[PDB]
Design a protein around this ligand. Structure first.
Ligand SMILES: O=C(O)c1cccc(/C=C/c2ccc(O)cc2)c1
Ligand SMILES: O=C(O)c1cccc(/C=C/c2ccc(O)cc2)c1
Lengths: 116, 115, 115, 116
């Protein structure tokens, strides 16, 4: 798993379950091409987005659909989504975990990057 | 001042000074059109981006150029930039402060919306 | 104003108003002695805690009563309070702002230290 | 594992390894009694602090020794430690993960609380 996403809910003190995530990769024409998508599990984790072969060098955008998440729980949140944009694999293959901690008017995101 | 941006540096414990910030408004065709921009001041703040008359309801994106900030400090960062995307709503309070707290591999952001 | 405290609410997107804050200074016997206290204002800020003359080098603790804040909003929170413990250092910049961003099961805190 | 601690480094984008953690529990006389201690592993996790039997109702303080961590890496940080104080098990046994994300002048902490 070269790319994993983990989402936590700071209101409930729980994993954020069933959060939609869309990943894009910048193409040669500078547009955002759809790359992979999925949703978080009961553990707040999303695995299996991509493979070592497919996850080449590039600029990637991980869009976490926080608004849709909060609305389903009866909260009208501030943000449309949380976007995480980064260059990947520019010094060879790495494993990336993108973590996000969500509140209705705030989020934090961090990356853990390891060398296989 | 319906929209203010404040940026802080979690490594040095200081305002993040001279950070480029670009604001975009989402157009009818879903593209992002430039709306306003500037650089944070010595206090890490950017005022005067827009006016009440111009800041109508709509979807806005605030892009903070965090990569350039870290590179100028000799620090290699993770993100290309920080992006804060939100809907302006007239029902809610009138003044929006978008705050961002920056680390090389992490950022947080919150909105303080008041009257 | 060598020491200011600012508290924000990440659920409502607002200042955290009327939050009790207590500051302690560590004594020679390692106990925490009361130093200053107050409640945050309508802007979520607490000014006037101390003076330059009184705020000497030492270890300080800022306790923010987050539990009472959430309970007053009908929300069950995790922490008893938020505690920020730090050393005041004369070598560094003169003004300390301790900021805290509150959620029911999480808080963040940063220091903005300036001249 | 009713109590687990996980620590991440926001400067390096990595687990925070070898971070000392001391847990205290408030006694009947209102003093903080030493309860358990340990340090984070290569994954930034600390397991095995306590047991279901030992981890009774109480007010607990988890002190994460962030200053000692940052100093070893050549950074003079702001905080002495990060303290996390909470009532545990007041509605029956729960599993607690205390997570902390560290920077030299800032930290964030969150709790994930699950029912076994
Ligand atoms: O709004 C101001 O005037 C203000 C002034 C000084 C500090 C801050 C901090 C905000 C913040 C953002 C994210 C986070 O995780 C913690 C704190 C805000
Ligand atoms: O890496 C994991 O598996 C993991 C597991 C459980 C919790 C977390 C939390 C991360 C986090 C993110 C943002 C923040 O502000 C504080 C903590 C990460």
């Amino acid at each position: 798993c070269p790319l994993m996403v983990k989402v936590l809910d700071a209101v409930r003190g729980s994993p954020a379950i069933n959060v939609a995530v869309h990943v894009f990769r910048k193409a040669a024409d500078d547009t955002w091409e759809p790359f992979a998508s999925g949703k978080t599990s009961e553990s707040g984790e999303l695995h299996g987005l991509t493979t070592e072969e497919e996850f080449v060098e590039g600029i990637y955008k991980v869009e976490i659909d926080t608004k849709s998440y909060w609305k389903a729980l009866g909260i009208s949140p501030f943000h449309e989504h949380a976007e995480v944009v980064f260059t990947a694999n520019d010094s060879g293959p790495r494993r990336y975990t993108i973590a996000a901690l969500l509140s209705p008017y705030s989020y934090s995101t961090t990356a853990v990057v390891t060398n296989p």
